[PDB]
Design a binder for this molecule. Structure first.
Ligand SMILES: *[C@H](C)[C@H]1/C(=C/c2[nH]c(/C=C3N=C(/C=C4\NC(=O)C(CC)=C4C)C(C)=C\3CCC(=O)O)c(CCC(=O)O)c2C)NC(=O)[C@@H]1C
Ligand SMILES: *[C@H](C)[C@H]1/C(=C/c2[nH]c(/C=C3N=C(/C=C4\NC(=O)C(CC)=C4C)C(C)=C\3CCC(=O)O)c(CCC(=O)O)c2C)NC(=O)[C@@H]1C
Ligand SMILES: *[C@H](C)[C@H]1/C(=C/c2[nH]c(/C=C3N=C(/C=C4\NC(=O)C(CC)=C4C)C(C)=C\3CCC(=O)O)c(CCC(=O)O)c2C)NC(=O)[C@@H]1C
Ligand SMILES: *[C@H](C)[C@H]1/C(=C/c2[nH]c(/C=C3N=C(/C=C4\NC(=O)C(CC)=C4C)C(C)=C\3CCC(=O)O)c(CCC(=O)O)c2C)NC(=O)[C@@H]1C
Ligand SMILES: *[C@H](C)[C@H]1/C(=C/c2[nH]c(/C=C3N=C(/C=C4\NC(=O)C(CC)=C4C)C(C)=C\3CCC(=O)O)c(CCC(=O)O)c2C)NC(=O)[C@@H]1C
Ligand SMILES: *[C@H](C)[C@H]1/C(=C/c2[nH]c(/C=C3N=C(/C=C4\NC(=O)C(CC)=C4C)C(C)=C\3CCC(=O)O)c(CCC(=O)O)c2C)NC(=O)[C@@H]1C
Ligand SMILES: *[C@H](C)[C@H]1/C(=C/c2[nH]c(/C=C3N=C(/C=C4\NC(=O)C(CC)=C4C)C(C)=C\3CCC(=O)O)c(CCC(=O)O)c2C)NC(=O)[C@@H]1C
Ligand SMILES: *[C@H](C)[C@H]1/C(=C/c2[nH]c(/C=C3N=C(/C=C4\NC(=O)C(CC)=C4C)C(C)=C\3CCC(=O)O)c(CCC(=O)O)c2C)NC(=O)[C@@H]1C
Ligand SMILES: *[C@H](C)[C@H]1/C(=C/c2[nH]c(/C=C3N=C(/C=C4\NC(=O)C(CC)=C4C)C(C)=C\3CCC(=O)O)c(CCC(=O)O)c2C)NC(=O)[C@@H]1C
Ligand SMILES: *[C@H](C)[C@H]1/C(=C/c2[nH]c(/C=C3N=C(/C=C4\NC(=O)C(CC)=C4C)C(C)=C\3CCC(=O)O)c(CCC(=O)O)c2C)NC(=O)[C@@H]1C
Ligand SMILES: *[C@H](C)[C@H]1/C(=C/c2[nH]c(/C=C3N=C(/C=C4\NC(=O)C(CC)=C4C)C(C)=C\3CCC(=O)O)c(CCC(=O)O)c2C)NC(=O)[C@@H]1C
Ligand SMILES: *[C@H](C)[C@H]1/C(=C/c2[nH]c(/C=C3N=C(/C=C4\NC(=O)C(CC)=C4C)C(C)=C\3CCC(=O)O)c(CCC(=O)O)c2C)NC(=O)[C@@H]1C
Lengths: 162, 73, 273, 172, 172, 162, 172, 162, 162
């Protein structure tokens, strides 16, 4: 899993050398930032649910036809799934903030994203909206660095999805 | 080959594979029909989960077959 | 082209200049628009040091532009001897190898894997050496560790372009030079999606490896001697990729990491995709 | 490799001298801008996908023939390559931007690229256009973000430009 | 790989849940100690060479036979290996110390070490001893530095110990 | 040259990915630290000379026999060299502080250290003392983080030399 | 690898001692025989092709089934292998003979040979037989040359035998 | 272990070829030489001790300060070691003469020489003197080829040490 | 080309080391032997022709049918070739003696032997007889080591041919 701390170790290790000043500097960076990161996570964790509802919803507004019978958005099972999925993404996003690296995101969400989505005919677009809508809401509860952090990670997924 | 430490620098879960060895897999650099080594009819190499698929497929197409797979640890 | 004398009758180091000709610079004596002759789009002259300045300015003041200048001593030198690479030599690491035999495989592996490039004591990799010689690592696995090492990325991969890093890899891991653009393209794509580690694996993983110098044989120069499925041009490419003994692949030299094999030469041997 | 700091060092080294006080003050101030610098980079990376997507659309609208049978972007596989190339150039540019130095970019990303394009027959010119198209879109984001403390980024914006341009030039 | 943070995550993941507030507070406080943590590491790295040098001297004073013909540390070649090994172990330990987790140490370093030693005929006992000798010397530095803000490092010191000990045990 | 900034780029580059949040965190670390680093450099740069004199001197006290005729410490040429050398190490250390990485040290001083020293029969020991003596003096003019930084780098050489 | 000289050294080393005068006298005399030793080897190498050819003929006259469909020396491909193998073994034996030590033979050739043969289904017995057949023919030459200074080679002849036999045994 | 005999076998073995005339010629060379080599060994073996005493001693004359308290040459333990060491080198040199190759030297003494010496702060210089002093003494008890041989090997170490 | 001298250089070169005693010993061997080798060559060179006639002849006795019309031995062209060839073989054998290695033989005669012979349907057998007959004659003009040498090389070909 890729976090700041793991990476410098890795790099040090490959070189076959002790952690010298260079790496510690980097580590320090991760720790200083954490305070902001951590804050952001507490905020997302709390409002989770509400964010999720809002998102799922949004998607339907954006793509009305999904809710029609014979479509994917239609029938509760699918809606349940759709909810689940978004919630899982949020959990990983909170995890990443705390871990201080994209690591958690990469391994759970991103790796294999495409093929999964292809085989089940999930359109990336959808997810994206979900995220965007979220981003917008988050853009109220948070501010300054905490906010900035939240964004970074949210986006990182947008980019991976697209 | 017993792993003295995790061989691979890049890190995942590591599995020990033991293979019956064709002459092709490890031909000696000799004139005439190449001969895999006697001493090791069964090479045994630790492999990351990521490289495990390739390694197996390549082993398969070459005569040699997987005697046994065992998690490295 | 070949230069026939290194020095002018009056003492003076001749330099060979190469230019892209222009209609102004030389034109046929016909009616109609002035054309240079097609076969001399890249023209080459040998000029003494004294006339060099003026000659170059005239070339540039017209539409010309100087592809390259090179001392005629270096030019008009033998193509590199192939004596040592015609028959590589070949190193086998036996199981139950002596202390010495392991050493000799390590040296050979550095030499081939790193180009004549020197590796300092601080650069050398105790840990991967340690694994060989108590068993546990193959020669093939050691080679994969070297091409994963930073030392390798610093030289061949972080300075030059992927297109050069590719052939540079083709040489180190297989004696061969690259054959056809297809190969260069595939590696470039694999690198974009999988990333650097996958690319390196794909040489060592590939069938040419194992079919030749499979396991426990340090890789040796296959090119310079006729190989299966190897275009002839590839054999000439090898002469560009491999200059002499005590010629290296160096990031350290001025504009260190350029492409030995001009992209048009690759396209000759096979264009498509 | 190299970057702003390392560079100044190297210069100093050849003189054989400790760093000039004046010279320190270049670096001292460079540090101060860091935060700005960072956000700039962040903005590019965040929008990457888009930047490209966008630039491409415009490039194909302009040079219709690229996507026509016989053109360089046709067929699919070639088109994919063209998209890939855009990404590569961008990625590097970003790198440079962080380093505060062209070098990194000049090395792997561009040194040799023009010749390749010519041999391939891809119009060096068209590629250069796309590089610019990218530039503009990118700046767009760098310069108009949300939730960042408002201030002056020009200095960085221009340096960004330059990088893009070195690219455009050497390719072209 | 793994470290303190990542770990807690993983646990949380299998439950399928957001991190508990309680759990955050583990990490929150872990952060606060960072500075201490860092200096600890720094101390080891700074003194590395010495730590080993020292431990070795003592190791060989004790087990004279290792350096006698027929012993395991003779001749030079072997001796070299033995020194190298000690160092490695150290290196890892440090890594762990920073990570705030044994894993890295166990997986990269300790795993298979015993068996190697066995096959070679290296006396595992002695190896373990050396590791301890190192431990004590190392703590020595961690705990008595220069220019550091005075405070309590115990918590870290003990964790350090544990790492050394896991090493000693698994080798032995 | 390895500095924090170069490394993360390198790592990013190898994997073939954009600089994401992970790396920036690290970078940030380097920049925050710089203020202390920079301070330390200004302090060493100023007292350079005095440090050098003191060191060279020390060495002779420590190894009297060097100054005897037929030895290395003997005759001005050698003394001049000895001075020069110590100054080179200091210059790289100042460069390192500022660069925010061991890089400068590694490439100038460290790489090839052994063989040079072997072929000219320079005993590492000497240099070491020089450094130590220095470290001691520096341990007055500096304080807090600035100090800590200075040490790190000075030591890094001790370790490389030994 | 190892040989008579090296060996004695190694022994001496573990005792930690200079070579005993007695021990030197083993080597001193060993030297004296050199010339004989050499010619012995030369004789084998000179006749190699034949030795094998011969042995094979006899081997197949005896065990007719090997060459019948279903046997192990059929078809061509296999036959080839079988010839190749015989040769190899020979090659090694010679090596040993020169070295004045079994090792080289045991380590690079014999070790694991049996098991290989087993896994394949090659009848080890027959292999052993072939080795002997070879032995006899080989001795034949070693012992009956022309234009060499006449004298007693027995000592060498017997040592030769032993090597062949170690082979036969370990395979069998 | 590298001796003439082992090497030709090795080379033959690698190519997968019988020992032909080429190699035997080489062998012949060795064993012819042996007579001289052997003689030299008998001479060193006998005078061992005396050579050792003389050497150790020499070193101290050459580097008086070693015998001062707080130094390496000081206190019996160290003297004992110093003796031991020189004796080991001599034993390997005798072994090499007899083996007819550098082999024994390479594997015992040379491989890892540097790092050992670095970590324990043994100055190559010392050993060297020891050797030189030896060489000088040997230059009396021996003569002609026997001598020449002795030198070769002694030197080989000097070069390795330096 | 493989001679004793070239090989030791090669081996030295591979390890990356100066020629030490080990290799010189080997070289010495080659040089001392030369005197015998050289003698042998002078003897073969002189009687060349006569050896050749005798050989060619022999072959025909051994394989009468070759001289019949419609066969290969038949018609002068072929006889001329047959002569040429054996003379070439003899020349390479003489060359090897002087060079002090199989080198010359390997590169001219041996490499590619099989395929040539296959494509033109030259039966190894023939050549062999030629050689044998030769060997027998040589076994008169020479004696002692000179002889031994001659044999070695002659045989080496027999083995290569068969
Ligand atoms: C929401 C925007 C839309 C929607 C989604 C939906 N998803 C599925 C099925 C799957 N979705 C995923 C996604 C994940 N599962 C994981 O474990 C992870 C990583 C943490 C993710 C992102 C997966 C894997 C599936 C496949 C099967 C499964 O049960 O998980 C469906 C069902 C489609 C099908 O079964 O073919 C749906 C509908 N639902 C909506 O209403 C939106 C349009
Ligand atoms: C027209 C059918 C297509 C075309 C032609 C074109 N050519 C040029 C420029 C040159 N073409 C030549 C050709 C020759 N030079 C020779 O001497 C000979 C016969 C021996 C040939 C056939 C050359 C050398 C030039 C360059 C210099 C010159 O002017 O002679 C151009 C202009 C290129 C420019 O940018 O200057 C063109 C357009 N290209 C087309 O558009 C048609 C498809
Ligand atoms: C010393 C007398 C002068 C000098 C030499 C120098 N060389 C390099 C770099 C290289 N030197 C070589 C040399 C060889 N390669 C070979 O394989 C052989 C024969 C087999 C030789 C002699 C090579 C390969 C290199 C490149 C790789 C490397 O890193 O060394 C340098 C360093 C160049 C740099 O810019 O890094 C130097 C300094 N230069 C002097 O100052 C002396 C006059
Ligand atoms: C897109 C903006 C324009 C375009 C691009 C294009 N490129 C190719 C093919 C290649 N591009 C490269 C170049 C590189 N070599 C390197 O090392 C790097 C990284 C520094 C690059 C970018 C290479 C090697 C190829 C060959 C094949 C491959 O895909 O790798 C094509 C395909 C055309 C062809 O292969 O002949 C295209 C389309 N050209 C355009 O038309 C756009 C304006
Ligand atoms: C320039 C294109 C835009 C802009 C930038 C701007 N940023 C700040 C200040 C900060 N920005 C950051 C961001 C980071 N610092 C880090 O360490 C990281 C990596 C994790 C990031 C992404 C931070 C922390 C600061 C300081 C606090 C703050 O947010 O203000 C400023 C303020 C001025 C200054 O830094 O000196 C500015 C101006 N503003 C613009 O005009 C553009 C939108
Ligand atoms: C020193 C305190 C003791 C000692 C050590 C010793 N080790 C070896 C040899 C090896 N030890 C290792 C160790 C490692 N392999 C790994 O992968 C790792 C962890 C990632 C380590 C630390 C290995 C690989 C070897 C074998 C290869 C080698 O040459 O080192 C020896 C030499 C054994 C020999 O007989 O050649 C020694 C001496 N043994 C002692 O005497 C000390 C008590
Ligand atoms: C513990 C074994 C000893 C000890 C540690 C200690 N350290 C601090 C505080 C700090 N230590 C550092 C060090 C670093 N921070 C970094 O970013 C880096 C890498 C470049 C290092 C090396 C820093 C910056 C701090 C904060 C300021 C300061 O130095 O005081 C403390 C104070 C408490 C705290 O948690 O901040 C302590 C106690 N002190 C001892 O007495 C132990 C022997
Ligand atoms: C001081 C502790 C002792 C001393 C030093 C001394 N040094 C030399 C010769 C050299 N010193 C160096 C060191 C460096 N040169 C570099 O390029 C670098 C990296 C920046 C270093 C560290 C070098 C390379 C030399 C050799 C070549 C040269 O002439 O510079 C000497 C002279 C020894 C000789 O000529 O063989 C001395 C004496 N002076 C003393 O008296 C102290 C004991
Ligand atoms: C011949 C007298 C008998 C015989 C031989 C035979 N061998 C094989 C196959 C192998 N034999 C070996 C032996 C070695 N390989 C080596 O590398 C060495 C030297 C270190 C030895 C001595 C090996 C390894 C093989 C397996 C791979 C190969 O093809 O060489 C066969 C064929 C087995 C098959 O089924 O392919 C045979 C026939 N067996 C007989 O029938 C004879 C009595
Ligand atoms: C023993 C199996 C049969 C035999 C051997 C024999 N040889 C000698 C003497 C010599 N043999 C050689 C041969 C070589 N010396 C070399 O350097 C080489 C490689 C280039 C060879 C092959 C030599 C030179 C001698 C010395 C005298 C001579 O010219 O022959 C003897 C005599 C005893 C002795 O060692 O001096 C013997 C007995 N002869 C037989 O009849 C045995 C059946
Ligand atoms: C004599 C000139 C000086 C001296 C030597 C001395 N040596 C050590 C310690 C060691 N020396 C060696 C050397 C060898 N041991 C071997 O087995 C071999 C290869 C066969 C060699 C050459 C080694 C390995 C050591 C390390 C520990 C040990 O004693 O085995 C010391 C002790 C230094 C310490 O504190 O550890 C000394 C003093 N003694 C003198 O007084 C001279 C200056
Ligand atoms: C003599 C025993 C029989 C014989 C021989 C004969 N040879 C050929 C043809 C060739 N002979 C060789 C041999 C060599 N040429 C070389 O250059 C070398 C290496 C130095 C050797 C050993 C070659 C290469 C050829 C083929 C090409 C050629 O024409 O020379 C023939 C003719 C076969 C044909 O098909 O033309 C013959 C007949 N002739 C006899 O009477 C004996 C049976």
């Amino acid at each position: 899993m890729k976090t700041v701390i793991t990476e410098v170790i890795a790099s040090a290790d490959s070189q076959g050398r002790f952690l010298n000043n260079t790496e510690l500097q980097a580590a320090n960076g991760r720790f200083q930032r954490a305070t902001a990161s951590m804050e952001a996570a507490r905020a997302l964790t709390s409002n989770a649910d509400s964010l999720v509802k809002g998102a799922v919803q949004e998607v339907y507004n954006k793509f009305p036809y999904l809710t029609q019978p014979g479509q994917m958005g239609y029938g509760d099972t699918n809606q349940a799934k759709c909810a689940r999925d978004i919630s899982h993404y949020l959990r990983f996003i909170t995890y990443s903030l705390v871990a201080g690296g994209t690591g958690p995101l990469d391994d759970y969400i991103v790796a294999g994203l495409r093929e999964v989505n292809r085989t089940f005919n999930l359109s990336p677009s959808w997810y994206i909206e979900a995220l965007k809508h979220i981003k917008g809401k988050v853009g109220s509860q948070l501010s300054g660095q905490p906010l900035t952090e939240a964004n970074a990670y949210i986006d990182y997924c947008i980019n991976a999805l697209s | 080959s017993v792993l003295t430490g995790d061989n691979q620098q890049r890190g995942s879960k590591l599995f020990k594979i033991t293979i019956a060895l064709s002459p092709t897999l490890a031909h000696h650099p000799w004139p005439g029909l190449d001969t895999h080594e006697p001493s090791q009819s069964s090479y045994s190499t630790i492999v990351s989960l990521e490289r495990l698929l390739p390694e197996m497929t390549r082993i398969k197409r070459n005569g040699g077959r997987i005697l046994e797979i065992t998690e490295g640890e | 082209m070949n230069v026939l004398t290194t020095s002018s009758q009056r003492g003076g180091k001749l330099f060979k200049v190469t230019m892209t000709l222009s209609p102004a610079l030389s034109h046929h004596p016909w009616p109609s628009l002035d054309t240079y002759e097609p076969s001399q789009n890249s023209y080459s002259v040998v000029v003494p040091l004294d006339r060099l300045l003026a000659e170059m300015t005239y070339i540039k003041n017209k539409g010309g532009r100087v592809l390259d200048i090179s001392p005629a001593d270096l030019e008009a030198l033998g193509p590199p001897d192939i004596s040592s690479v015609a028959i590589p030599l070949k190193v086998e690491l036996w199981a139950k190898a002596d202390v010495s035999d392991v050493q000799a495989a390590i040296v050979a592996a550095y030499k081939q894997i790193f180009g004549n490039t020197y590796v300092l004591e601080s650069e050398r990799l105790t840990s991967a050496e340690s694994l060989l010689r108590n068993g546990s690592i193959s020669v093939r696995e050691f080679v994969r560790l070297l091409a994963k090492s930073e030392l390798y990325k610093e030289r061949f991969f972080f300075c030059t372009s992927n297109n050069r890093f590719t052939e540079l890899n083709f040489k180190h891991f297989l004696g061969r030079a690259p054959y056809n653009q297809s190969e260069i393209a595939a590696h470039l794509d694999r690198y974009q999606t999988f990333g650097y580690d996958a690319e390196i694996d794909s040489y060592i993983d590939s069938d040419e490896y194992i079919q030749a110098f499979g396991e426990n044989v340090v890789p040796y120069y296959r090119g310079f001697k006729s190989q299966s499925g190897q275009t002839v041009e590839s054999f000439n490419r090898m002469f560009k990729l491999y200059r002499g003994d005590a010629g290296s692949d160096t990031n350290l030299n001025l504009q260190g990491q350029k492409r030995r094999v001009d992209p048009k030469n690759l396209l000759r041997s096979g264009r498509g995709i | 490799m190299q970057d702003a700091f390392t560079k100044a060092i190297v210069a100093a080294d050849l003189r054989g001298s400790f760093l000039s006080e004046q010279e320190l003050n270049q670096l001292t101030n460079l540090v101060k801008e860091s935060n700005k610098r960072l956000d700039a980079v962040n903005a590019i990376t965040g929008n990457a996908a888009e930047i490209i997507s966008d630039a491409a659309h415009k490039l194909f609208a302009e040079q219709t023939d690229l996507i026509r049978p016989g053109g360089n972007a046709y067929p699919n596989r070639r088109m994919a390559a063209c998209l890939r190339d855009m990404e590569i150039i961008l990625r590097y540019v970003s790198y440079a931007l962080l380093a505060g130095d062209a070098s990194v970019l000049e090395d792997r990303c561009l040194n040799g690229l023009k010749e390749t394009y010519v041999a391939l027959g891809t119009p060096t010119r068209s590629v250069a256009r796309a590089v610019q198209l990218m530039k503009e879109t990118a700046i767009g984001y760098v310069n108009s973000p949300s939730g960042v403390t408002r201030g002056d980024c020009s200095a960085l914006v221009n340096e960004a430009a330059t990088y893009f341009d070195k690219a455009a030039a050497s390719i072209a």
